Every structure is written in structure tokens, then in C-alpha cells.
Structure 1
Amino acid sequence: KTITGVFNSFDSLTWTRSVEYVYKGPETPTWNAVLGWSLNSTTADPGDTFTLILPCVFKFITTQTSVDLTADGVSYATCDFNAGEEFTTFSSLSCTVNSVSVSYARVSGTVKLPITFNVGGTGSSVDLADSKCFTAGKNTVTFMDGDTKISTTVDFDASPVSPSGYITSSRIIPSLNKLSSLFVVPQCENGYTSGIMGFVASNGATIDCSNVNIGISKGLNDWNFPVSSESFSYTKTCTSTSITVEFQNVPAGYRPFVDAYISAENIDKYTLTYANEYTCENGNTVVDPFTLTWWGYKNSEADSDGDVIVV
């Protein structure tokens, strides 16, 4: 049977500052959620299942496929990771109660979950919906186990990047071994007469034209991500090495953007060249191309006990 209410508290949510990562953004690795759980052997049997819901969580930052609910060296349950990614706005754990060698009436413990939150990234239905998940500063993060809501407070820093200029972002989608990559045109106060937005991939990256989004968004969220996407006047061309969108007559209040999936020979190293041309309405054409090299810190099934890599 499926049981609910196993997870019963949200104990802490804290961000781990590393060398690669600078500020406590919601999408920045790594957030650690400590959750409380309790099992009662009169209402839970070995093989029964239960799930934890993580609204607004893109993925788990781990090489493991599962995490156990353990206390004092005993594994009471095994919980498989199911990242939301671009498929659902939430991630989850699907858990199974384990048989144990002790007999308990009631047992309780905690589990630590390494996560990043989803506050936008692409024009997909998933990312647009999660773009409204949080605002800058203090938030309440709520997870659910059936009808049980468990929550805690956290403080999320806004992006340090100004929203006025061009915006770029890329994010690994672990289950696909792809990245999404986003470009938002610099802001024009009075709409745009015209523009060319997009990027050309090199250094072993190619563009996946079957997963692109082109839209105008009514402004950007606290992390510079599209919050809406409407159609508008543009033509596009997508090839294995470039996506190029030429647009016309976009109204004031809106930001054109373009995003695509990227297949990289090395998911941790690739280079994009961005065309970045735009002519604000009443104004003259700006041509400001630039190049970025994107660096990643994803690990291949590391883990962590008995698997090691030959040189």
C-alpha cells in the first residue's frame, strides 16, 4: 500500500558556498534540505510506498539514484530521486519502506537532500510556471507528503546581473545529458523596431533544434528569467551549429528571448557566440556580438563507495 505523512518536518534549508559558486541564488548549487521523517510499524510495512513532493525544485545535485532514511546505522527506507527538470515543475522522492533487523514500534530521523530550485531558464511551460515560484528575499519553501505540508523559511538573493543588458544562462538537464541555454535581448524602453538574437555553438557543442523556445516575455523575474511567452513577428533558422531569430516590431514592456537545448561532447566545456543585434524603436541599430565559454562542474556517476576510475 501507499502511505502518507512519513515526512513530518522541514528542519533546515541552507546553501553551501563553494569556489565555483558565488551567491545564494535559488538555481545555484548547492542547497541542502534537511527533512524529518517518522515511521510507525503498526501503519507501515516493508514494501509500502510513500512519496515526498518538492515544488519548485529542478533537480538533485548528486550522482546517486537514491537516498536512504537512516538512523543509528539502520536503513528504514529507500527513496529514489525523481528530478522535475523540464518535465514537471516539481521534483519528488519515490520511497519504499525497508525491512529491518531491529523491531520498532515508532522510529524517527532526518535525511539531507541536495537540490537546486527552478526559478526559470527557458520559454517552456515548466520554466515559465516556476519563474513565479519565489521572489527576492525571504520565502517560505513548502514540501508535501500526501496532504502533509512541511515548510521552512529561506532567504534567496536576487541576481547580481542587471536586467537592462543582455541575459545569458545555461543549465544542465542531467537525465538528458543536455543543457538548456538562454539569451534575452538587451532592454529597449520603447519596444524594438528589429533585432537578431541567437547563438552559434562551437567546441563540440551542437544545437538541438527539436527543443527551442522563441517568445516575448512581459519583463523578467528577480533572476532575469522570462515570466511569460507570447508569439510575435519573427523568422528563425535553426541548424546543428546556430540558432538565429530575426524579429520585428516588438512592443514596449516586452523582452524577446531565445533558448535551445545543447548537446555538448563535453557537458562541462563549450562555447557560444551571440549575434546580439537590436534596434530600439525610434533609435539606431546596435550590433554588439560577444562570445562566452560555459564551464560546468557536473560529476559522472561518481559514487562514492566502491566505484573508481582508471587513468
Structure 2
Amino acid sequence: GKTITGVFNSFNSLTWSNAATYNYKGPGTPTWNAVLGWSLDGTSASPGDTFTLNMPCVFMFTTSQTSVDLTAHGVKYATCQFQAGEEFMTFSTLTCTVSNTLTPSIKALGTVTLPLVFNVGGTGSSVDLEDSKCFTAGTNTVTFNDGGKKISINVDFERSNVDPKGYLTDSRVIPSLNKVSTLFVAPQCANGYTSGTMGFANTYGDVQIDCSNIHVGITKGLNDWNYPVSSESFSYTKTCSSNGIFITYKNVPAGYRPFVDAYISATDVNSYTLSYANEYTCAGGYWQRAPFTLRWTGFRNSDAGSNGIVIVA
């Protein structure tokens, strides 16, 4: 029937719950539990009606579930659907629907908790690049929307403990494609890069590179969690197979960091290994060829649930 608004009306709590062993409290590190207040009124809301909650800068929900129910006392008065932004968009949403239990008489209240990770960058995609300027370390204000009607809360974010002068890698799962997105940023040559090679290959036949979905570029500095803030182009040659992706670059400018990121499929996405190529000759003669191998593991999923109170009137 109608498309109601203002159901989610309060941002009660936004608290971190380290999913795995991350050594900092960042928005890009799971899991952040958003507790939101909701209220449905039978007099003004009818079964079938629909409401969206729009959540900017939220990458995905760190749960295997595809929906969460608004449940006041073992009873379900609405079903909500998770729509992760991932790499498709900069925001995620909750598309909900009123259940047939919400009769004119019934008024349901309560809270819902939502395991969410933010997108503070991670690839050259327009999506991550915009979302890479969404938060900064320290005290931040996070705002969700319900159709013109906003709910906000303050939260403290910590920067990364990894020193941004060395080589930097990260990884992040994309469930809607069964793909893991990984990143590689060469060590910092403060005055620019003369030459260099950089990439990553699979190890022992479990990893494959999605050649179609690569990004290669240079970043003018980085954001607080060691992710690219912008992707320009520069002078490289590109070799890419389903086995592994490598570039040989030249003629870099001071203040810029070269990076390469790509979609992959590994057998067990919560345990895999990659081999990284690493030469760089700085603007300064410091030629050094330092390849390595890095193992990548899993996150600890959480649950979305709700509780509530009902008033039969």
C-alpha cells in the first residue's frame, strides 16, 4: 500500500567487536554493532507497507543471514532485507516490509542490532575511492537515513597501526560474487619512483586472479587506514593471467604511491596464500628486490537480532 517512514528512530549504540585479531579499531575492520530503535504503529502502519533504511559508507553486513526480523516478543511484526553496497554502491540499505500481525490495535517497539563493516577504501573503484574520504581517525559522526528523517551517533575510530612507509596489503571478502578483493601498495619512495615491479600471484593452485577486474593506478597520499584516496594513471606495462597479475612501471612523481588491486577466487576464502613481487628503485638509486609470501585468514561472523515490547490497544 503506502511507503511509511520513521520506523527506525534512534541510534542507540555503535560499538566495535573485533571479528578476528585486528590490531586497531577501524571502521573498515569488522564487526561494528549498530543498535537502532524501531517502532511500528498499527493505526498508521498496515501489513504490506514498506520502509527503507539507508546507510551511507556501510560496505556489508558481517552475517551469513540475508534478512532480519523486527521481533517484539517472539513475534515478528516486520521482515527486513539486507542489501550490501559492496562494490556496487557506496551505501547499504535495509528494505523492510510490514507483517500481517501488525493489526490496527497493535503498537510494537524495540531495538535491532546490526553487524556492520564500513568501507573506507580498498580498490580504485569509484565506490571505494569516494568512500575513502568518508571517515577519519578520532571522533566521527555516523548518520543513517529513513527517507529525509536522519538518525546520528558519535563514535571513535582509530587509525592503522601498520606504518605507511613500507609495503601495505589488505584483503576483503565480496560475498555477492564469491570473490575476495586484495590490495598491494609498494613501499614509500618519498621523492618518487624511477623503476619498479609489483604484483601478486597465487600459491599452490587454490587462488585464481579475475583478470577482468583489476585496478592499477597511483595514489596521492593515503587515508587513515592505509587505503588509496585517488587513482591516476602512469607509465606501466601490464601482464595478467588467471595465475597472477604483475606490472612494471616507470616515471613516478614525488608524493604518489603505485598500487594494484584485483578480484580473486580462493578455495577456502578464510585461509589462502599469495606470493608478492617487490622491486623498487627510488629516485635516489635505492634499488632493492624483496619478494615475499603472505597468508590470509578469516573473520568471525556475528548475528543480527531484535527484541521488543508490544502494546495491544
User: Into which bin does the TM-score normalised by the smaller protein fall?
Assistant: over 0.9
Cα deviation code 1:183-227 (max 9, x no counterpart): 001111111111111101114011111110001011010000000
Distance in 2, Cα, partners of 1:125 & 1:64: 27
- Counterpart of 1:230 in structure 2 is 232
Q: Give the 3-state SS of the residue equivalent to 1:129 in structure 2.
A: helix
Paired AA for residue 244 in structure 1: F
Distance in 2, Cα, partners of 1:35 & 1:74: 18
Distance in 2, Cα, partners of 1:176 & 1:298: 19
| Equivalent residue pairs, number | 303
Q: 1:295 aligns with which of 287, 294, 297?
A: 297
Distance in 2, Cα, partners of 1:19 & 1:85: 20
- Counterpart of 1:34 in structure 2 is 35
- Counterpart of 1:254 in structure 2 is 256
Q: Give the 3-state SS of the residue equivalent to 2:77 in structure 1.
A: strand
- Counterpart of 1:147 in structure 2 is 148
Cα deviation code 1:67-121 (max 9, x no counterpart): 0112222211110110110000111111001111765353321100001111011
1:70 aligns with 2:67: no
- Counterpart of 2:190 in structure 1 is 189
- Distance apart, 1:17 and its partner CA: 3.4
RMSD: 1.9
Structure 1 length as normaliser, TM-score? 0.93
Q: Give the 3-state SS of the residue equivalent to 2:225 in structure 1.
A: coil
Question: 5 Å matches for 1:1-80?
Answer: 1-17=2-18, 20-80=21-81
- Counterpart of 1:116 in structure 2 is 117
Distance in 1, Cα, partners of 2:298 & 2:155: 26
Tell whether the 8 Å contact from 1:272 to 1:292 is kept in structure 2 after alignment: yes
Paired AA for residue 238 in structure 1: C
- Counterpart of 2:101 in structure 1 is 100
Distance in 2, Cα, partners of 1:240 & 1:286: 27
- Counterpart of 2:308 in structure 1 is none
- Distance apart, 1:242 and its partner CA: 1.1
Cα deviation code 1:126-168 (max 9, x no counterpart): 1101100100011001000100110101111100001111110
Distance 1:101 1:219, change over 3 A: closer
Tell whether the 8 Å contact from 2:114 to 2:304 is kept in structure 1 after alignment: no
Distance 1:101 1:44, change over 3 A: closer
Distance in 1, Cα, partners of 2:62 & 2:177: 15
Distance in 1, Cα, partners of 2:283 & 2:19: 43
Tell whether the 8 Å contact from 1:49 to 1:95 is kept in structure 2 after alignment: yes
Q: Equivalent pairs: percent with the same residue?
A: 68
Tell whether the 8 Å contact from 2:186 to 2:278 is kept in structure 1 after alignment: yes
